[PDB]
Swiss-Prot record, chain A:
CDD domains: rhv_like (cd00205). Residues 1-217 are annotated as: Shell domain. Keywords: Capsid protein, Host cytoplasm, T=3 icosahedral capsid protein, Virion. The record marks 219-220 as: Cleavage. It comes from Norovirus (strain Human/NoV/United States/Norwalk/1968/GI). Gene3D superfamilies: 2.60.120.20, Positive stranded ssRNA viruses. Residues 398-511 are annotated as: P1 sub-domain 2. One of its GO terms (molecular function) is identical protein binding. This is Capsid protein VP1. Residues 1-12 are annotated as: Disordered. Residues 271-397 are annotated as: P2 sub-domain. Coiled coil: none annotated. Residues 218-270 are annotated as: P1 sub-domain 1.
Amino acid sequence: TSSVDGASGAGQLVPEVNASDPLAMDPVAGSSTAVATAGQVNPIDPWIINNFVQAPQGEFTISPNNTPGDVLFDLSLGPHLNPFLLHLSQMYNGWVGNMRVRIMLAGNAFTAGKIIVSCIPPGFGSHNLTIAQATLFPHVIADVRTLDPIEVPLEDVRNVLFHNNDRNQQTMRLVCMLYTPLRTGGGTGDSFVVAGRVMTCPSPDFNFLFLVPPTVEQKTRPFTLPNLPLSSLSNSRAPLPISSMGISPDNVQSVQFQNGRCTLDGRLVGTTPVSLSHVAKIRGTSNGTVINLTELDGTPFHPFEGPAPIGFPDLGGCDWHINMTQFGHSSQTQYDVDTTPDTFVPHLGSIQANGIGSGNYVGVLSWISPPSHPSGSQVDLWKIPNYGSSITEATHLAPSVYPPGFGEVLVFFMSKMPGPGAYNLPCLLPQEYISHLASEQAPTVGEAALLHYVDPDTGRNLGEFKAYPDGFLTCVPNGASSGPQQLPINGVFVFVSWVSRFYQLKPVGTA
Amino acid sequence: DPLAMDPVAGSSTAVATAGQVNPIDPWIINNFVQAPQGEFTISPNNTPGDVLFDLSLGPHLNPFLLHLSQMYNGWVGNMRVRIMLAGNAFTAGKIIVSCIPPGFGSHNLTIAQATLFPHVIADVRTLDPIEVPLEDVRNVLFHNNDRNQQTMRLVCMLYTPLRTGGGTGDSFVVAGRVMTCPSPDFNFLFLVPPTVEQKTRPFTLPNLPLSSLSNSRAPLPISSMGISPDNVQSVQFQNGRCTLDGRLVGTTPVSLSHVAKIRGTSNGTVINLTELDGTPFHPFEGPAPIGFPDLGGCDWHINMTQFGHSSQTQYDVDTTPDTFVPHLGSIQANGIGSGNYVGVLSWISPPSHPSGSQVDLWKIPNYGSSITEATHLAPSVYPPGFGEVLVFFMSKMPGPGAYNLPCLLPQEYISHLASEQAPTVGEAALLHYVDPDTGRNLGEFKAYPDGFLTCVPNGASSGPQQLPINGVFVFVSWVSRFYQLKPVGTA
Amino acid sequence: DPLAMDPVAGSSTAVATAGQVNPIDPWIINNFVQAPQGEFTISPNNTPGDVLFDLSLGPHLNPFLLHLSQMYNGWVGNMRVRIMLAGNAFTAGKIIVSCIPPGFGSHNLTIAQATLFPHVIADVRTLDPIEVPLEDVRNVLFHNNDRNQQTMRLVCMLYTPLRTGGGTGDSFVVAGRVMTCPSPDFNFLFLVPPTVEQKTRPFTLPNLPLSSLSNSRAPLPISSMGISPDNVQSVQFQNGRCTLDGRLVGTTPVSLSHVAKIRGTSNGTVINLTELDGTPFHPFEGPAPIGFPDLGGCDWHINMTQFGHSSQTQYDVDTTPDTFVPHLGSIQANGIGSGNYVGVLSWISPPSHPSGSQVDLWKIPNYGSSITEATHLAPSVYPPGFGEVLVFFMSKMPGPGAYNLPCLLPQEYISHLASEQAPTVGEAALLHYVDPDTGRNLGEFKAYPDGFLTCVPNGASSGPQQLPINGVFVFVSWVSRFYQLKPVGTAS
C-alpha cells in the first residue's frame, strides 16, 4: 500500500470518512476540445497519472491564533500544482484538463474545528470573501479530525479551446479558509498545531500542447536558491564577510534599508547594485567645498531615478568616513563625512568636502565612528541616513519591512565592522543571493516561502524560516534570549514549500 | 493505492550462467528477525524531515544469512521489511518510507522530494505492522561478494510531527522496531571452501577488558579514557596508526616489543639509526625507523644497553636543533661511547630549549626537514559529523609531574586488526561499551576506517572519563552519515 | 547500403529487473533537432586522420532527452544521427563516420583502419545530409546516468585532404552540423525527483550584462575586454581560477569579500598571516592564504584597519626581498605598529627594487622559495587552437599611471559555476557574445574546461576591444579542441 491510516488503533474517537453533499457543478471536458485546432497533443507519462504527490504548495497550519475567515491555502489551476508537471511544463506551450487534489488533516481526538473549501470561476475578480459568501459558491465543509483525506476536483471552466503559458488567462481557484475556530480539550500545552498536507495528481484528460525549447519561457521557471554555505558569503551593505545571524532589539520592529534589497522574483529596489564592486562606494568631482556625485562609471546621476546614486552607502546612525583614491595620481586620502547638516544632500547630487582638494575621486567606506554632532551618541546601525529633503522631486525610497506572522521577528545577517567599538552591521539578504535572484527571475507562486537551514554533510535541520516576496526572512525565537544567534554559520538554506502569510513556524533555538 | 514499482525477478535469472543454485534452510525463510539497527524513537522535539532510519539490501541484514554468506560467492533475491510502532489512541503524527534505486547518489531530501519515490505514508496509531518489499533492482544477472555493489535502500523520515493529548508531557516517545526476512526467491550461488575468501570476513574486536591492554606509543598499561581540550581539535600521531582493514601507517609495528625503541651505531658525535633487527634504515620508506618514539613537546630521555657488555647508560635526547634528523637516520650522540646500542624509552621531562615549557603530549616531534627525500608523514585526523569528538586511551607516564600519554588505539587491537584483514563496509562501525559480567550497555561509539573512535559527550564535563575501565568494546553494525550517536556520560 | 550491424533489442531486456519502464512523447521520436554537440568545422589546416567530432550514445545527445533525463536515473535504446556540411564547388575532400563498440580501447587509427568499422563515407560537395544509426551494444541490461561507463561511439575523421582551387583564401572554412533523434525503442527507467542528481545538469552561464560584473584579482568593476601583448603567450594567475565543473584552484575564494585581502598580527618587525576568518594558515594547503593578492610586477601598498581601534594605516609592500615569504606565513612590517590588522589592496605603484622598471600586471608575485614544503601553484594556461589568443576581462587600477588589471573570469561567473556544478561534456564550450536588446550576435568565443576564454582576432589592430561591454555571454555548443573560430572585430 501507499497510505495506512491508524483506524485499527484510533479507538472510534474521530470521524473517518467525510460526509458531505457533492459539488454543485457540472463536469467540464478536457483535451477533446483541443484535438481539432491545436498543433500537437502530447501525452504525459502513465506513472504520473494516478500517484498523488505533495504539491509545491503542500503544507499548511491550523492554530488557536487563527480567526475564522483566514485563508489556509489558495490554489490556481495549471501545471504548477504538480512538481512533475512543473518540470514538464518548461518543454511545452499550453495545456488543457482538470486536476485532482487531496487534503490531509488528521488532528488529535481532543480537538475541534472545521474548514471550508470553495471553487471560484474565472471572471469573478479579486475580492476578499467572508465565510458567508464562501457558501454561495460550490463548497465542501470538513472536520479537522478526519482520518481519510478529502478529494476535490479542480475543473477547467473555459471560454476558449485551450490555454497558453502566458498572462492572458485566468483560471479556476480553490480557496480554503477556516470555518470554525480551533479549540482543544484536556490539559493542553500550547505548542499544539494541526499540520495539514496537500497532494495533487493530473486527471486522465490533462494534456500538454506544443513542443518548445525547454528553458526559454520565463513563466514556467521554478524558484531556487544557491547551494553555498553562509560563511563564504558577504554583506550587502558593506563589502564585509558574513560572521553571524541575529535579531534586532525589541524597540526596533521595522527597517527601511536602501542597499541589499531585492524581491524574490528578481527586481532590485533602492540603490541596490548587482555586484559587490559597487557596494558602499562614491565617485565625484571635488570643487574645494562641494563634491558633485556621479555614477560609479562616470554617468550623470539624475535625481528622478533614485534617492542617491547606485551603491551609495546607507549606514544611518554613525559618523562614517571613507578612503578616496584617484586615477592617474599617487596618493590615498581620508574623507570625513557627517550625515546630519544642511550640506549633505545626496538626492540633489552634492555632498561636503571638508579637506578634500579639487579633482575627481573614487572612494570606498573603510570604518565608522560614533556620530559627533547630535548629542554625543552611540552607534545605531539600524537607522538610515538623511537623503535630500526635496520639494520639487519625488524621493523614491524603498518601503519599510515588518514581520507579518504570529510571533515573528526579522532575521539579519551580521558582519564585524572596524572602528572604535564592537560594531555589527546587519543586512536583509546576502549579495550572492541578490545576484542569483536577479539572474534567475522565477515567479513567486504564493504568499511566502518556507525554508530550512540545513547542515550539508549530516543533513540535520537546524532551523525553520519564512521568506517574503519583498526579500526578507523571519523566524520565531524560542525564548527571551534564544534565537538564530546560536546556530552555526556553515549551513545552507533549502527551499521547502510555498506557504501562506499566516503559516506558523516552530521556534528556533533552545530556551 | 499500490506502490509505484513492478515485481523484480529473483534467482531465476541466475540459473543459466551461474554454476550452482543453492537452497537455504526453510526455517529461515518466512521468519522475521530484528535488523542490526532496528531501533528508533520519535519525540515531540523532532521536526519533519528528520531521518529516522536507513537500510540497504543484502545478506548483512540477517545474522543467519551473514553466517551462511562465508560459504558461497554470490547471491540474488528480494527481502521483506516489517515496521512496528508503539503508540496510543491519543496520539497523532505520520512517517514516510521511500524506496531509492541504486545509482541515485547521496543527497539530502525534503518530505516533498520524499513523496517523489515509491513510498508508504503511515500513522503512528497503526496497530498492525507495516509491510514493505525490498526488491533487487540490478543491472547484472547476479551479485558477487563485493562492495562496489550498490543495492536498493530504504530511508524512513518523519512526515508530520508528533502531537499527544491529555496530561501533555515531553517524555512520551514513540518507539519503533524494524524486522526483516528473506523472500523465497533468495538464493546463494556457488559452494566455496569456507572462511577463505577475504571479501566475507566479518569485522570483530578482541574480547578482553580495557584495563588489561597497553598503550601504543609507550610500553605502559592503559589507565583511563579521555578527550582532548578545546584548543586541540586536530591530531597527528605516528605510532598507533592502523586502518580498520589492517594496514599499518606511519612507524607502527605489530608487536609491543618494538614500541618506543631505537637501535644505533655510535661514533661519539652522531648515532646512525638502524632497524631493531640490524637491517639498515633507508630514508625513502618513512619518516623514521619503525618503532621510533613520537612524543612531541617533550624532553624524552632513554635507557641504552648493548649485547655483550654489562652496562646501563642514560641518554638525553633533544628534538629541537638540526642535529636531530631521524628522517636521514642520524641523531645526537651527546656522551655515549662508540659501538652499537639498543635503547628503550623510560622517563620524560619538560623541554629545555624554548622557555622550560609545560609538558604537552598532544604534539608530534620535529622530524628531518628534508628537501630531496619524501616527507611521508601519516596524515592528520579530525572528528567528522555533527558534535562528535575524538576519544583517546590515556596512560600514566613516569617523570617529575603528572603526565598522561594519549593514544588512538591499543596495541592488541592493532595486532588483531592486522591479523584479521577484514574489509570495511560503509562509513563507520557502531560500537557498544559492555560490562563483561552483566552484559549491560554503557556507551555508544563510532569507529572510523582510518582507525579512531568518536563519541558525543553528554555535558560540558561529562564523557568517557566517567566510565569504568574493565569494559569490552563490541561491534554492532555498519552505519551511514544519517545516524546520530546517543550522548555518553552522566549529565 | 545499410550498416554492417544487427538490430539491437531495447527495453525488452530491462523489464524483469528494472523498477519501472517509462515511455517518451511520440512527437520527439522522428524529429531531428540539433544536438548540444552539434557544430564542427573542416579547414585546410586539418590533416587526414584528424578527429572532427566524437559522440557517445546516451540521452545527452538530444536537448529534449537531456531535459527529460533530470527526472529519471536510467535509460536504454538506440538513436539516429544526421550530418550536414556546407561546402562549395571549389572544395574537394571526403569525411568518414565510424561506429566503435565499447571495450575496444584507445588506439591511434589509420584511415585504412578507420574503414574497418561500420562506416559511412561522405563527399564535402554534397547538398544533402547523411544518416547514421547509433545502436546500444550492451554488456549489461541497461544504463544509469553515469558517463564513466562505456557506450558506443561515433567518430568522424577526415578521409582525404581538403583542397581548394583558384584564388586560395585560407579563411574558407566548411561548417558542419549534427542532428539527433531517438529511435522508437528508447525508454527511460525510474521516476526520480527533478534536478537533484548532479550528473544530468546542463551547463549554463548567468544572464547578466558584462558591465555589471567585477574583477577576480581585485574588487573593481569590469571596464573592458582585451588581449595580451604579443611577447606574453602564457599566463599563470593564482586568483580567479575555476574549472567549468566548479572546482576552485589556487588561492581563489567564492565571494568578492575575500579578494585581495590580508589579515595578520604584527610584532613590529614581522606580520604573521592567518586566514581571513581567524583560523591558522598551514603551508601545505596552498601557496598563500585564500584571497592573498597576486599582482606580480608592481609595488602594491594596502590599506589596513583594526577591529576595536580607531585608526587607518597605509602599509607598503615590496614583493622582491627575502622577507616576503607568504608560503611560510610571514611578511615584513616596515612601518606599522604591533597587533592584529586586516588590510585590503587600494592602489599600486611601479616596482622599486630591480632598476626602476615599469608596471607589468601579466606577472604573478614571488611566493617564497620553499622546497621542504611543496609550493602548490596553479598551472599555466595557453591557447590551444589555430591562431587563438587568451581573452581577458580588464579593469582600471588607481595609481600614478593608466593601469589596467586583467583577469581570466568574472567573479560572479565563479560563484555561479561553484554553485551549479555541471559536468563538462566535451572538450570546449562554444559561446556567443549577444547584444541583449536586439538579439544580434557580436562575436564567437571558446571556453576551456580549465577556466579561460579564447578568440581569433581579425588582424594586428583588431580584437574584442572594439566590442561594447553591455553584452551577455550565451552558451551555444560543445565543440572539440580543434574547432576553428571566425575572426572577431573589424578588419585592419
